[PDB]
Design an enzyme around this catalytic site. Structure first.
Site, PDB file in Angstrom:
ATOM      1  N   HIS A   1      34.307  -2.147  28.530  1.00  0.00           N
ATOM      2  CA  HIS A   1      33.802  -2.438  27.208  1.00  0.00           C
ATOM      3  C   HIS A   1      33.724  -1.231  26.290  1.00  0.00           C
ATOM      4  O   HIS A   1      34.169  -1.302  25.147  1.00  0.00           O
ATOM      5  CB  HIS A   1      32.467  -3.154  27.214  1.00  0.00           C
TER       6      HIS A   1
ATOM      7  N   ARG B   1      43.786 -18.555  26.866  1.00  0.00           N
ATOM      8  CA  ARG B   1      44.588 -17.427  26.427  1.00  0.00           C
ATOM      9  C   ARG B   1      45.485 -16.976  27.570  1.00  0.00           C
ATOM     10  O   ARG B   1      45.515 -17.613  28.622  1.00  0.00           O
ATOM     11  CB  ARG B   1      43.708 -16.279  25.959  1.00  0.00           C
ATOM     12  N   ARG B   2      46.210 -15.878  27.358  1.00  0.00           N
ATOM     13  CA  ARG B   2      47.186 -15.397  28.329  1.00  0.00           C
ATOM     14  C   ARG B   2      48.000 -16.569  28.863  1.00  0.00           C
ATOM     15  O   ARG B   2      48.127 -16.759  30.071  1.00  0.00           O
ATOM     16  CB  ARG B   2      46.492 -14.651  29.461  1.00  0.00           C
TER      17      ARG B   2
ATOM     18  N   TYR C   1      34.953   0.718  21.834  1.00  0.00           N
ATOM     19  CA  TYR C   1      34.256   1.529  20.851  1.00  0.00           C
ATOM     20  C   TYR C   1      34.951   2.862  20.686  1.00  0.00           C
ATOM     21  O   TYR C   1      34.909   3.479  19.618  1.00  0.00           O
ATOM     22  CB  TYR C   1      32.795   1.695  21.252  1.00  0.00           C
TER      23      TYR C   1
ATOM     24  N   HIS D   1      38.314 -13.251  18.408  1.00  0.00           N
ATOM     25  CA  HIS D   1      37.295 -12.204  18.278  1.00  0.00           C
ATOM     26  C   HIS D   1      37.930 -10.835  18.023  1.00  0.00           C
ATOM     27  O   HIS D   1      37.766 -10.273  16.940  1.00  0.00           O
ATOM     28  CB  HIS D   1      36.355 -12.201  19.507  1.00  0.00           C
ATOM     29  N   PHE D   2      38.693 -10.326  18.987  1.00  0.00           N
ATOM     30  CA  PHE D   2      39.156  -8.940  18.900  1.00  0.00           C
ATOM     31  C   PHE D   2      40.291  -8.672  17.903  1.00  0.00           C
ATOM     32  O   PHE D   2      40.414  -7.555  17.395  1.00  0.00           O
ATOM     33  CB  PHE D   2      39.445  -8.332  20.289  1.00  0.00           C
ATOM     34  N   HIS D   3      41.104  -9.687  17.610  1.00  0.00           N
ATOM     35  CA  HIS D   3      42.155  -9.513  16.607  1.00  0.00           C
ATOM     36  C   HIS D   3      41.540  -9.194  15.235  1.00  0.00           C
ATOM     37  O   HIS D   3      42.162  -8.515  14.405  1.00  0.00           O
ATOM     38  CB  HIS D   3      43.120 -10.717  16.569  1.00  0.00           C
TER      39      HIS D   3
END
Ligand code: HAS
Ligand code: HEM
Ligand SMILES: [Cu+2]
Ligand SMILES: [Xe]
Ligand SMILES: [Xe]
Ligand SMILES: [Xe]
Ligand SMILES: [Xe]
EC number: 7.1.1.9
Lengths: 33, 166, 554
Positions: free
Chosen positions: C225, C441-442, C229, C376-378
């Site tokens: 995780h 996903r994947r 950051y 989320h991450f896109h």
């Protein structure tokens, strides 16, 4: 000059987006429960 | 100006942190709420339950597809699901409703997902580890199981089925 | 050039970037086709004619994941978070060690790339065991990530040495960031280090024949995780200290940005269990713990929202900013350097609530491993971070090379920059939707067309977006290659200082900043919270090892 008017507007929009999303999926969690 | 905005900026930052903290505590209050209720059954058992993945489907409760399900309480049933390269045994898994079903899932090969469409059953299955979950579908009909962890070229095709009886 | 002999730190900073952008470009090619795959459109046979060496969807996703998320990001972090401190302090980094970490980076990329391009390590970017790649991929990973360990040392060097000439003065802003950043990165790195030294390396070589999956994906998430950051803070630095300038104002608070960066240093590491909610073998209480801590680590970002928002309101008012939404219009909307990151912050907005949801322990089960997560991450990395990277070339690229930017490439950038945000927004709508609808996903879902009928409408967007983001990419390749391959060179703006922003500071500041400057102490705190968070579980896990054999499923 004064108040973060537009800034508090931005962190308001954020706050409504967290509640819409979080409460909206807190519903979806129980409905598949 | 510049320095009449600095103190006010630092002032309304202070209330935001106060407010935002509280709302997270509201959130920690509703997550804990769900942890105290029944829906909390979906959290995978905390205790370690090691298995040999090289010997799972030949010896022990998984070895036999007809042995998959077993009545262990008055209204409690334990299903021994096996998630493998591009499929699930038993297919279809057959289970009654109003009934608590204790899934016990492992894999003989690689990590697979176990996502039962329409429920909160979403668990990673780790080879040489049994995932233990508790669920009761108040809903009767056709439960399908999905692999949601990449597990090989046929991963998109790896489907399964919980046959739940009305 | 006289530039690279008094500031050769400008030469090593340049290579680090291009290398990473070449990768970014390569990896981004698989993007559209995956956007199509998730619109039920199968464009890969077409891709297989285009790039003959490509064997499977999952090889394309692995290359897409790795090159964009690992190489490009790390190289960018290493660039921004070495050069910017160096320039703030006007101190040359240890050039010996600076080059070593790059050669490690290039050779680590070359070693690893070989089996990915030859399909001997189609294991995605998370390389979850028992899925067994070729040793040369794992080895490649370790050398590349070890490159940052030299980096850490480099910035520390620059921070000990600056402390020496100014005994007792407060660590200047950016250094402070880069410092907590790099320390925070060190603490996190250990999870992947141990995974590598104890399992993945001896295993892929042949020394051992089993690897436990549960501990392997735990140590992983120890680095797992916080690494996100480690991608992000290099933008945060740029957002905090360069953007207010690019907006025409001043960073409205020093102690806040420090406080932001301080907390991330604290809480970036002891939260990885918010990824393994659907894992067995981990106590329920420990999960709730980590979930609470993950809720807390949302705060630094929350502060940032307020601190930056203000910094662009104040910057907007200065531009002749009107009432509630006038200052928004008052910003320099012709500026690629300004526009790009702001957009990403807009997308970061639906991005954050997405993160927060995922964080709510139980609520994960609704979304875990669905298309929603990529949603989320896109919005976070592919939107905010990559955007911040692109538009940044518009001041960073002239500064290191002397090459001026035409009004053509400037607007070309706005074209590329605007499309990219839009496409990501489309896609964000698509993926989350599909995520709420159970779409995993994947997944190469285009080869099982009828498997997911109930996803009609969001599948449109992912097709729509796929077109959208195919167009921006080519323009990006062209628009960048135009900037890199023109011999237009001005020697003066190549010595021009970086557009750092003014720091509004008050009376209370000193007292708080000092406490934060107790970095030697603070580093111990975050170290302790990690042993508290992982230690109990880890030791419980290490005494009960069950190593399973390797597998290849491609
Ligand atoms: C660079 C992208 C990275 C960021 C950033 C990020 C943010 C968060 N994430 Fe995450 N994440 C999770 C938790 C969080 C939380 C709590 C945050 C927080 O840091 C988010 C904080 C953000 C905010 C609180 C919003 C602040 C808004 C701002 C700052 C913008 C304001 C706008 C302005 C100021 C502009 C105004 C301008 C004008 C002109 C008006 C969890 C669970 O707890 C999962 C598990 C999913 C699963 O099931 O596997 C997860 C999944 C992932 C994965 C998938 C990994 C995989 O492949 O398996 C990646 C790559 C990733 C990266 C990133 N993630 N995350
Ligand atoms: C050209 C624009 C891009 C498009 C259209 C795009 C599209 C996608 C799609 C549809 C997926 C889901 C594939 C799947 O999980 O089966 C995906 C996955 C992913 N993308 Fe991108 N992406 C783009 C750029 C980027 C960037 C800039 C980054 C990071 C720097 C990135 C990193 C990732 C990662 C880490 C995954 C997850 C892969 C996995 O789950 O193993 N992508 N992308
Ligand atoms: Cu995370
Ligand atoms: Xe790499
Ligand atoms: Xe690695
Ligand atoms: Xe490593
Ligand atoms: Xe990650």
């Amino acid at each position: 000059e004064e108040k973060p008017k537009g800034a508090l507007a931005v962190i308001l929009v954020l706050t409504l987006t967290i509640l819409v999303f979080w409460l909206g999926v807190y519903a979806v969690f129980f409905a598949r429960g | 100006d510049e320095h009449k905005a600095h103190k006010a900026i630092l002032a309304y930052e202070k209330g935001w942190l106060a407010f935002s903290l509280a709302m997270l505590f509201v959130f920690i209050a509703l997550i804990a709420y769900t942890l105290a209720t029944h829906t909390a059954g979906v959290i995978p058992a905390g205790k370690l339950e090691r298995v040999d993945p090289t010997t799972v489907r030949q010896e022990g409760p998984w070895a036999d597809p007809a042995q998959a399900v077993v009545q262990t309480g008055p209204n409690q049933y334990t299903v021994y699901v096996l998630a493998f390269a591009f499929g699930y045994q038993p297919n279809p898994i057959e289970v009654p409703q109003g009934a608590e079903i204790v899934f016990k899932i492992t894999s003989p090969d690689v990590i697979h997902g176990f996502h039962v469409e329409g429920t909160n059953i979403n668990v990673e299955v780790l080879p040489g580890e049994v995932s233990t979950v508790r669920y009761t579908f108040k809903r009767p009909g056709e439960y399908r199981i999905i692999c949601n962890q990449y597990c090989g070229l046929g991963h998109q095709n790896m489907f399964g089925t919980i046959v739940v009886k009305e | 050039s006289r530039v690279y002999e008094a500031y050769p730190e400008k030469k090593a900073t340049l290579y680090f970037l291009v290398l990473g952008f070449l990768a970014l470009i390569v990896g981004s090619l698989f993007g559209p086709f995956q956007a199509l795959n998730y619109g039920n459109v199968d464009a890969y046979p077409l891709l297989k004619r285009l790039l003959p060496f490509v064997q499977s969807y999952y090889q394309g996703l692995t290359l897409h994941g790795v090159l964009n998320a690992i190489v490009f990001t790390q190289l960018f972090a290493q660039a921004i978070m070495v050069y910017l401190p160096a320039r703030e302090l006007n101190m040359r980094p240890n050039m010996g060690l600076m080059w070593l970490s790059w050669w490690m980076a290039f050779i680590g990329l070359v070693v690893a790339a070989l089996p990915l391009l030859a399909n001997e390590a189609t294991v995605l970017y998370t390389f979850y065991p028992p899925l067994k790649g070729h040793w040369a991929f794992y080895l490649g990973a370790s050398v590349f990530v070890l490159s940052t360990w030299v980096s850490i040392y480099i910035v520390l060097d620059l921070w000990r040495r600056w402390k020496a000439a100014n005994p007792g003065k407060v660590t200047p802003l950016v250094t402070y960031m880069a410092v907590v950043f790099w320390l925070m990165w060190f603490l996190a790195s250990l999870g992947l280090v141990l995974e590598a030294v104890l399992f993945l390396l001896p295993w892929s070589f042949g020394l051992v024949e089993g690897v436990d999956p549960l501990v392997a994906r735990t140590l992983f998430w120890w680095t797992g995780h916080p690494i996100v950051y480690f991608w992000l803070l290099p933008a945060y630095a740029i957002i905090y200290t360069i953007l207010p300038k690019q907006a025409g104002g001043k960073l409205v608070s020093d102690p806040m940005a420090r406080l932001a960066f301080l907390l991330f240093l604290l809480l970036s590491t002891p939260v990885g269990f918010h990824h393994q909610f659907a894992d067995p073998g981990i106590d329920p209480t420990w999960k709730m713990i980590h979930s609470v801590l993950t809720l807390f680590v949302a705060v630094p970002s929350l502060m940032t929202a307020f601190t930056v928002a203000a910094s662009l309101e104040f910057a907007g008012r200065l531009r002749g900013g009107r009432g509630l939404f006038g200052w928004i219009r008052a910003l320099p909307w012709d500026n690629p350097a300004f526009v790009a990151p702001v957009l990403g912050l807009l997308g970061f907005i639906p991005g954050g609530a997405g993160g927060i949801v995922n964080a709510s322990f139980t609520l994960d089960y609704v979304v875990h491993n669905t298309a929603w997560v990529p949603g989320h991450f896109h919005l976070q990395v592919a939107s905010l971070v990559t955007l911040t990277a692109m538009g940044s070339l518009y001041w960073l690229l002239p500064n290191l090379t002397g090459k001026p930017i035409s009004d053509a490439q400037r607007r070309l950038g706005l074209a590329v920059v605007w499309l990219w945000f839009l496409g990501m927004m489309i896609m964000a709508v698509g993926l989350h939707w599909a995520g709420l609808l159970n779409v995993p996903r994947r997944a190469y879902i285009a080869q099982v067309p009828d498997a997911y009928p109930h996803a009609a409408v969001p599948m449109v967007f992912n097709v729509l977006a796929g077109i959208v983001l195919l167009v921006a990419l080519l323009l990006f390749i062209y628009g960048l290659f135009s900037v890199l391959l023109s011999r237009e060179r001005k020697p003066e703006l190549a010595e021009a200082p970086l557009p750092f922003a003014e720091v509004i500071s008050g009376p209370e500041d000193r007292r708080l900043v000092l406490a934060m400057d107790r970095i030697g102490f603070w580093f111990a705190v975050a170290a302790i919270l990690v042993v508290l968070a992982y230690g109990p579980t880890l030791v419980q896990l290490f005494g009960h090892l069950n190593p399973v054999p390797g597998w290849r499923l491609w």
